[PDB]
Structure 1
């Protein structure tokens, strides 16, 4: 649309500067990749200084985001950029931001299991967990957010859908306490977590450090075990499935013990790189982490199942959110019973 093109043009010229000052309106169009758009400097123009030739314009939702929330999100994004753990940040303004376009493609679900890529993901996740960030270090995110989601679900206006509420079908309010008790018995260090290391958020670089993570919507200080366990759960789900419900679950694609240990070995090699450990101490760290993840992986099911019920309340036919929620809760109980 004429207005959207004009805004993108103005934002690029004003926030990027340099060669962008010489671009004429008729030479620039936005390409949707929807709230995300690619903007490219015309080929005939040389760059002036270090200003980027390739950016992504990210527009914020029509949805209300609090002031404090936007401060935290923007500060987080800016810091991860400086530390080379996310895309560079080139503009912040009320409507959105301009980010580095990373030449890349996202991973696919099946690629997560390839040993060399899985080792690289482990290494990157551990790098992320090494970050000191200016946010609360108290680990209230996991159960605080789940408690909030449950309250929000309880408060939803009735819609007319006749089915038993999933909170009741799966006794989720009671079950949350059972999970809390289990995880309270399971030590897991509190670290800066990504919280959504799915294939769609892992970019395979065309100009390799071979990967970059994106999508920090959910990132927070949280239990290490959640970030790893959540990643393992993602081996099961493909969100590119082309028929309703527009995801597919393959439960047998959950990582085997050997696949989990391979990831864990590479994770710990990075996490513990500055430490002098015997092979025996290393073995213990690996075994303990295997158990830790087996339990915190259950929180991935529980968290996303609750989140998905809320998504269903704002959706119709574009994705089977309620179906997905039920899949996560079924796997929760199955895996809980296999402990």
Structure 2
């Protein structure tokens, strides 16, 4: 039950006392409870609560989450969060300030990688993503995010000068593929792959899906998608393809390189069909009322769409991870992860016949 630094405790007390109504407003510092949920250098998370012996005066929360950012993007992220809260699609927003946010506390745990393949879990994720994709949001709707970001990362990657031997070697191998040309071949494939532009999460992995406390044995409505900070208008195929890729990566491994990758855990076509069978009628209202024939065509075209876009998940996050090897202050086997994504990229490309 980790306690924050006295400085952080006092700042948290003041934020809660000033931004939250009812019993919070008259709270004494020596009555304030706070514990560290997640440490680190950025997005530190704390649980803040009233004393058990303090009654609420109205409908103020008894417990809240404090997010500290640490050490235009701010405007967009804050507006998006506020909008998703209003629409009941994310945690409520209780307070916003230069240093962080006070959010609704949602009793829950995160999903584990293996849970992504449970049929009921996968069905709900599909429904939740289809819902998220229907959001109208006040952001640029031109789908420049995917290749814009890949181009940016590629430029950064080409110019990295490592000083450490193993990183120099792994980088040389990764750049030996001719990434500018390969990126262009990917662009060509994806340009011939129709995929609607929708508000995408862009990071639908197990670590960003809450299993809601007390709902674990309920068939539906037991999940919440969170951590929208990378969301943007983007190709629908990317969001689904990226999710499918996440079946293969477990980030909870406690030893170096602090992840495991398993190509054999990518969803089978049967599993993908189960997922898209839940996605489609959640995204397109009267989908169920189409002929078995037209449903099957729509499903077949979507399978090809999402599996082609899955290549962009590998390519983008592969480049991303090389960049983190250069710039990150967090411990993780970034170069080995990069190699794993590019290995998966070529394996997938082969299976596609592309």
Query: TM class, shorter-chain normalised?
Result: over 0.9
Tell me by how many angstroms 1:245 deviates. Answer: 0.2
Q: 1:30 aligns to what SS in structure 2?
A: strand
* Structure 2 residue aligned with 1:282: 295
* Structure 2 residue aligned with 1:171: 178
Tell me by how many angstroms 1:48 deviates. Answer: 2.1
- Root mean square deviation, CA, Å: 1.5
Task: Tell me whether 145-154 or 106-115 shows the greater mean CA deviation.
Answer: 145-154
Structure 2 residue corresponding to 1:197, chosen from 169, 194, 204: 204
- Segments of 5+ residues of structure 1 without an aligned counterpart are 63-67
Cα 1:318/1:50, change in 2 over 3 Å: same
TM-score, structure 1 normalization: 0.95
* Structure 1 residue aligned with 2:154: 150
The alignment of Structure 1 onto Structure 2 pairs a total of residues equal to 334
Cα distance in 1 for partners of 2:204, 2:273 equals 18
Asked if structure 1 preserves the Cα contact closer than 8 Å seen for 2:33 and 2:51, the reply is no
* Structure 2 residue aligned with 1:186: 193
Q: Does 1:23 align with 2:27?
A: yes
* Structure 2 residue aligned with 1:53: 62
Tell me by how many angstroms 1:27 deviates. Answer: 2.3
Tell me by how many angstroms 1:43 deviates. Answer: 1.3
Cα 1:153/1:273, change in 2 over 3 Å: same
Q: 2:233 aligns to what SS in structure 1?
A: strand
Q: Deviations over 1:295-334 (max 9, x none)?
A: 0011110111111111111347821011101100011011
Q: Spell out structure 1 runs of 4+ moving beyond 4 A.
A: none
* Structure 2 residue aligned with 1:75: 79
* Structure 1 residue aligned with 2:237: 225
* Structure 2 residue aligned with 1:65: none
Asked if structure 2 preserves the Cα contact closer than 8 Å seen for 1:170 and 1:329, the reply is no
Structure 2 residue corresponding to 1:116, chosen from 117, 120, 123: 120
Tell me by how many angstroms 1:2 deviates. Answer: 1.1
Cα distance in 1 for partners of 2:280, 2:314 equals 24
* Structure 2 residue aligned with 1:40: 49
Q: 2:331 aligns to what SS in structure 1?
A: coil
Q: 2:254 aligns to what SS in structure 1?
A: coil
Cα distance in 2 for partners of 1:255, 1:222 equals 22
Tell me by how many angstroms 1:279 deviates. Answer: 2.1
Q: Does 1:14 align with 2:21?
A: no
Cα distance in 1 for partners of 2:181, 2:11 equals 50
Asked if structure 1 preserves the Cα contact closer than 8 Å seen for 2:112 and 2:207, the reply is yes
Cα distance in 1 for partners of 2:308, 2:115 equals 24
Q: Deviations over 1:145-196 (max 9, x none)?
A: 1111112223445434432435523322211101000000100001110010
* Structure 2 residue aligned with 1:271: 283
Asked if structure 2 preserves the Cα contact closer than 8 Å seen for 1:23 and 1:42, the reply is no
Tell me by how many angstroms 1:25 deviates. Answer: 1.4
Task: Tell me whether 153-162 or 216-225 shows the greater mean CA deviation.
Answer: 153-162
- Segments of 5+ residues of structure 2 without an aligned counterpart are 216-220
Tell me by how many angstroms 1:30 deviates. Answer: 2.5
Asked if structure 1 preserves the Cα contact closer than 8 Å seen for 2:174 and 2:339, the reply is no
Q: Does 1:338 align with 2:351?
A: yes
Q: 1:242 aligns to what SS in structure 2?
A: coil
Tell me by how many angstroms 1:207 deviates. Answer: 5.0
Asked if structure 2 preserves the Cα contact closer than 8 Å seen for 1:167 and 1:173, the reply is no
Q: How does 1:180-329 map to 2 (within 5 A)?
A: 180-206=187-213, 209-275=221-287, 276-315=289-328, 318-329=331-342
TM-score, structure 2 normalization: 0.91
Q: How does 1:83-98 map to 2 (within 5 A)?
A: 83-98=87-102
